[PDB]
Amino acid sequence: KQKNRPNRLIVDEAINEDNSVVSLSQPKMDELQLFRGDTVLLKGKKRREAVCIVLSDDTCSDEKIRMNRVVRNNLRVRLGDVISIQPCPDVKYGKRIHVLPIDDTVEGITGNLFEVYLKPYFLEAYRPIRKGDIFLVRGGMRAVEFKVVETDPSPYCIVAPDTVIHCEGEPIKREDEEESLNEVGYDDVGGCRKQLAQIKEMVELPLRHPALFKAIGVKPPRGILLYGPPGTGKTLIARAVANETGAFFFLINGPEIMSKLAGESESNLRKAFEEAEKNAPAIIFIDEL
Amino acid sequence: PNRLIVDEAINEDNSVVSLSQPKMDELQLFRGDTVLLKGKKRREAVCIVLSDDTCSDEKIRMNRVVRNNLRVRLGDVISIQPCPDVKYGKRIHVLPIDDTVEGITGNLFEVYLKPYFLEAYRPIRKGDIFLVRGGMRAVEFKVVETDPSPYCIVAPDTVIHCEGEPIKREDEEESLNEVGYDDVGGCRKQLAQIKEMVELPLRHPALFKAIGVKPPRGILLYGPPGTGKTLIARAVANETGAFFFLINGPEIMSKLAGESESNLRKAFEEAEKNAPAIIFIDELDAIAPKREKTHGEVERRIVSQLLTLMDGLKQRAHVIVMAATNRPNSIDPALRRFGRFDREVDIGIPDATGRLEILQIHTKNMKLADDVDLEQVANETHGHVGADLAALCSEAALQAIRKKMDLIDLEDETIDAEVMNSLAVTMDDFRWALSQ
Amino acid sequence: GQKLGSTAPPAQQAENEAKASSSILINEAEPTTNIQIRLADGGRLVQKFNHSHRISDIRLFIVDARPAMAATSFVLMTTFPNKELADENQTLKEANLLNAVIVQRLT
Ligand SMILES: Nc1ncnc2c1ncn2[C@@H]1O[C@H](COP(=O)(O)OP(=O)(O)O)[C@@H](O)[C@H]1O
Ligand SMILES: Nc1ncnc2c1ncn2[C@@H]1O[C@H](COP(=O)(O)OP(=O)(O)O)[C@@H](O)[C@H]1O
């Protein structure tokens, strides 16, 4: 189409809740000659990689590539960034595999995490996994995070029915650049698409392309007022928007502010704005304005 | 000498100045002459003189660009002398002024200088500072070298040098980034009165220091929000070189119940120093709401404090107090008393004509697509006020940037000029904004 | 030395200017217009004495003026709406040149 080297795509929200799945528009797969189940290799930021399976999408847009937060993270990318998708016909069913849960995701529960999570998860699915990726498994009224420690056939391998799965005692630590899939994302908000869409574009440039307004004379929005009954998800939305754009999020709560003595209240107010500007881009959320 | 009084400008072109046929006829200045203009403290400037019909024979319509280089405000006098020696140029060295480039990278020449001089035959003097709009901003350039010397007319053969360093803004040199009359649209009648009242006291201090006539000391601007009251006020301040001091309602009423009055007072104090000064009180209904609107002694101690400072304002140390509010009812009747805000200017919402003007003012730095019909846009924004249109414009622009942005146009890293200069806002962009 | 672009290219022309002027017709009976001719031939300032003449005259005039001009193609303009004197046929009155400054552009 001229410059995009036909494999550079923009990361859009996922439609299929499966983490191993990513979607492209058919007219896009044909161009890249991939198959309705072809296993692809995605390259993101911080020179990270992910191995996913591709399916066609009637609602997907030619330039964009749908994928859920799990993959989006593994790739060290946010909605709106760009990645390079590439065919990966060299993937081979894996011999052995060693994964380990993350400390905070298993605290409280005990027992065989294998037969309760890892087994039903990989079972006859044929999930292509890379080394270092972090996947999530839901069940037992919670979701456990697992980090692929080692794959037999080295960088990546497809967990076949004969693949030996090792999950030897120990819960590893969560690193700095590795967010919890327990954090709030747009996938945790339902019943708002229209409004969630308005807000997304409003903050898109100011929060994703700060530099822009540095060299521009145009005025971006500063304050956004979210109105609706209580429990509608406003707090949820604001927090979801912050994370989903990697922006600093500072919370001010009406009652909190009003519980203090007058001067203290102001103090706190300017403190919030102060701390916010130091870690910009930021989103200050006043709950119960 | 036929020295003229400087007035308003009519074509946004900087290099041009206007007189009346009657004025030009007397000195043989012909419909295009590269007239010379001398003025304040070591300042001159060469400009193309056209002619206007609505201009008065004694006044010369020029823009803030000239005016500033001429170091003069609207109302001063100038000696418009024909400049015969002005000859096409061979080379010129100009440099972008820091504060007007910080943000943009890339070749300025290609984006600004070129389209600006291209087959225009613009006559420029040394040291002059011209304004070039585009790329959603307006860069300022300083002429530091010419060849021919002193001045010249940039021709399609003149070489243009854009040496590697952005210079600084000398503090004797005002920015065109500042508010001015050309930034206000739709307010003609009212913007007229204000100038008329403030004129003498702000412009001719000495006069009152010799006569016993009472000058206007307190002007009250009404109107809904976004009408341009703060705008108007600051404009008049710059336009008349008068000291401007801002006092904001919330800011005052946020302080302690003593620190507040402390400020109101320190405010008037520092204004009496730099007079002629304009003290703008924004959101006066916040500091002095009508009688029944008050609840505590503190709220009342401040309103009173303000009334006093007003009465204390003597003819000597002339400063004019302007305050904006959303309507009469708002304010405390006491502020109306002869000696205080006895001068009231109502600034309503723009009409289809007015709206048009404002929209052009807020697009002067952007590239409008030929399919853009602002007059149409003006026609479907009834209620809308200045701020609404100004914002509407930002939305259009932003909407356009969002479109051509995903194309992976270098974004997220410090900006590139040419990139911004191509991006054009389509009538669809406004259409989208409107439906928001 | 120099470098290229997109544009174009002794004292006895006191006679050239004389013959340029003596080339004229000036209907005593007819109204005047004077013209400021900006010769592209440099910062060559020119003074006219026309009275409702046509652009062919301005053209022949420049030709009478500078020798080179006699062979070089160019167009005449009005700066600031910057329009280019299109039909070089029309009387100065129709074009609204009446006491104007026509600049020469080498095309
Ligand atoms: N639109 C929604 N979609 C999914 N869950 C929601 C939604 N709105 C509210 N919730 C749930 O209820 C809680 C209400 O959260 P909150 O955002 O704080 O409400 P509000 O700010 O509107 O008072 C959320 O944390 C979430 O678990
Ligand atoms: N009449 C106008 N002409 C051009 N711009 C205007 C006008 N009125 C408002 N604006 C724009 O909207 C903003 C509103 O400014 P402001 O003066 O602070 O409004 P107000 O005092 O009525 O609340 C201005 O900074 C300006 O950019």
Curated annotation (Swiss-Prot), chain A:
Which of the residues bear the PTM Phosphoserine? 20
Tissue specificity: Expressed in the prefrontal cortex (at protein level).
Mod. after translation: Phosphorylated by tyrosine kinases in response to T-cell antigen receptor activation. Phosphorylated in mitotic cells. ISGylated.
Q: Which residues form the signal peptide?
A: none
Glycyl lysine isopeptide (Lys-Gly) (interchain with G-Cter in SUMO2) cross-link, renumbered residues:
1
Subcellular location(s) per record: Cytoplasm, Cytosol; Endoplasmic reticulum; Nucleus; Cytoplasm, Stress granule
Binding of ATP 1 occurs at 230-236
Function, in words: Necessary for the fragmentation of Golgi stacks during mitosis and for their reassembly after mitosis. Involved in the formation of the transitional endoplasmic reticulum (tER). The transfer of membranes from the endoplasmic reticulum to the Golgi apparatus occurs via 50-70 nm transition vesicles which derive from part-rough, part-smooth transitional elements of the endoplasmic reticulum (tER). Vesicle budding from the tER is an ATP-dependent process.
Question: What family name appears in the similarity comment?
Answer: Belongs to the AAA ATPase family.
Q: What is known of its domains?
A: The N-terminal domain shows evolutionary conservation with that of PEX1, and is able to bind phospholipids with a preference for phosphatidylinositol mono- and bisphosphates.
How would you summarize the oligomeric state and partners of this protein? Homohexamer. Forms a ring-shaped particle of 12.5 nm diameter, that displays 6-fold radial symmetry. Part of a ternary complex containing STX5A, NSFL1C and VCP. NSFL1C forms a homotrimer that binds to one end of a VCP homohexamer. The complex binds to membranes enriched in phosphatidylethanolamine-containing lipids and promotes Golgi membrane fusion. Binds to a heterodimer of NPLOC4 and UFD1, binding to this heterodimer inhibits Golgi-membrane fusion. Interaction with VCIP135 leads to dissociation of the complex via ATP hydrolysis by VCP.
Q: What is this protein called?
A: Transitional endoplasmic reticulum ATPase
From Swiss-Prot, chain C:
Q: Which UniProt keywords apply?
A: Chromosome, Cytoplasm, Cytoskeleton, Golgi apparatus, Lipid-binding, Nucleus, Phosphoprotein
Query: Where would I find the UBX domain in this sequence?
Result: 28-105
- Self-association state and partner proteins as the record states: Part of a ternary complex containing STX5A, NSFL1C and VCP. NSFL1C forms a homotrimer that binds to one end of a VCP homohexamer. The complex binds to membranes enriched in phosphatidylethanolamine-containing lipids and promotes Golgi membrane fusion. Interaction with VCIP135 leads to dissociation of the complex via ATP hydrolysis by VCP. Binds ubiquitin and mono-ubiquitinated proteins via its N-terminal UBA-like domain when bound to VCP.
Q: Tell me the gene name.
A: Nsfl1c
**Post-translational events:** Phosphorylated during mitosis. Phosphorylation inhibits interaction with Golgi membranes and is required for the fragmentation of the Golgi stacks during mitosis.
Name the organs or tissues of expression.
Answer: Highly expressed in heart, brain, spleen, lung, liver, muscle, kidney and testis.
The GO terms describing molecular function are: ATPase binding; lipid binding; ubiquitin binding
Q: What is this protein called?
A: NSFL1 cofactor p47
Phenotype when changing residue 38 to A: Reduced interaction with VCP
Q: Give, from the UniProt record, the effect of changing residue 80 to S.
A: Reduced interaction with VCP
Question: What is the protein's known function?
Answer: Reduces the ATPase activity of VCP. Necessary for the fragmentation of Golgi stacks during mitosis and for VCP-mediated reassembly of Golgi stacks after mitosis. May play a role in VCP-mediated formation of transitional endoplasmic reticulum (tER). Inhibits the activity of CTSL (in vitro). Together with UBXN2B/p37, regulates the centrosomal levels of kinase AURKA/Aurora A during mitotic progression by promoting AURKA removal from centrosomes in prophase. Also, regulates spindle orientation during mitosis.
Q: Which family does it belong to?
A: Belongs to the NSFL1C family.
Known consequence of changing residue 82 to A? Reduced interaction with VCP
Superkingdom assignment: Eukaryota
Annotated localization: Nucleus; Golgi apparatus, Golgi stack; Chromosome; Cytoplasm, Cytoskeleton, Microtubule organizing center, Centrosome
Give the stretch of the parent protein shown, with its full length.
257 to 370 of 370
